[PDB]
């Protein structure tokens, strides 16, 4: 399955996206295998990023314990900008799963908030 | 730390469609919630049945009351009448003298 | 086989010492029995308040028809009172003694 | 380790001991090791050295019998039970309504005990 390449970097600097960040297809790239667990690291193929599973995602995330190279299907979402605009996230109510331990896409991903360190004038 | 993060974890949710979901309770923990529960309604079953006992019985005292009132009202213009009743029969009968 | 021997595990005891304990149940039975019984709660609360407010308005319509009907009868008596008293004012001004 | 010798014959033969079949302390021979919700494991076999015979458990018994998993050779003291002849006296059992453990998976004290209602079958005379 083909993931929704570099759509992290289109959720914060394309305003259609951003108002509406959702049937993106993300890699898990990493988790703490309660709230710190619901703080998950998603990879797009170019970029990873911090998520946040909120809601019905954050039950279902737990109860399937879907883990690093599971490929999802993001349903309900919003990003957020915090600490004075340092730390990205994408808070995810709800997803599918679309493909479970599927080999990893991209290992040498760029950190989403590291490419918006060297180009902040690119977020809205 | 991420606590700025994990600060929007129960931030009101822009969908509607977001449910809130609390971890999962073991039966142990579950149980004693509902029985709880159990004893709360009982409880409330207990007084809203008491309360439909106080009610109807206040109704049937309001009505008893209104009733007694109202029989005594009744009364005092039934006494009124028979006094004009009595009052024309006694001029009736000064004017047949006797 | 032993079934006319097992008859005896509820005969009334002899003993006032002896007392009747429930047979185990899992927390899997305890918390269902528990869920179910919260359920019918709900459902016996939803009616009784729905009756406790059908018994107010049937009050508050009795009420008022027994204030309109003893209204009724007052203002009869005092129509009456009234014929009574004009009866008596036709008689002193007709003078029919001549 | 000390039964009650022969107080199996005594409760159903003597009016006094009848009347109050208690402190007998008795060994359990044998137990129904049932579907969870079954008053079946409540029917047991016991021992006073001498007879066997069969006890209902009953009440706070039953009750304290299955959660302290008593198995035979354990040691009990009854305290409250009542005697039944049950199908016009061919059935012979103690409803045992409480009980003490005195001693927990001793060795069992007689392996060939005679069965009280065998006994009684033998010598119909005797039993009230
Ligand atoms: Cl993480
Ligand atoms: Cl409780
Ligand atoms: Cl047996």
Same mark, same amino acid.
């Given at each position: ?124 | ?20 979901? !609390? ?9 004693? !919630? ?43 213009? !039934? ?16 004017? !047949?003298?006797?």
């Amino acid at each position: 399955v083909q993931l929704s390449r570099g759509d992290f970097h289109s959720i914060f600097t394309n305003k259609q996206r951003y108002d509406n960040p959702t049937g993106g297809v993300y890699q898990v790239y990493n988790t703490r295998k309660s709230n710190r667990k619901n703080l998950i690291m998603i990879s797009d193929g170019i970029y990873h990023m911090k998520a946040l599973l909120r809601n019905q995602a954050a039950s279902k995330f737990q109860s399937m314990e879907l883990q690093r190279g599971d490929i999802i299907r993001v349903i309900i979402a919003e990003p957020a900008i915090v600490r004075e605009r340092k730390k990205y996230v994408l808070l995810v109510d709800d997803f599918e799963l679309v493909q479970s331990r599927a080999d990893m896409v991209n290992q040498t991903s760029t950190f989403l908030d590291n490419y918006f360190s060297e180009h902040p004038n690119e977020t809205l | 730390d991420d606590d700025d993060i994990l600060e929007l974890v129960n931030r009101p949710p822009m969908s509607q469609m977001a449910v809130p979901i !609390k971890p999962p309770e073991s039966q142990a923990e579950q149980l004693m !919630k509902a029985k709880g529960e159990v004893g709360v309604l009982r409880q409330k079953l207990s007084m809203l049945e008491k309360t439909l006992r106080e009610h109807d019985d206040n109704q049937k005292k309001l009505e008893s009351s209104l009733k007694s009132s109202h029989e005594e009202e009744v009364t005092k213009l !039934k006494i009124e009448l028979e006094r004009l009743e009595d009052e024309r029969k006694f001029m009736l009968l000064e004017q !047949k003298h006797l």
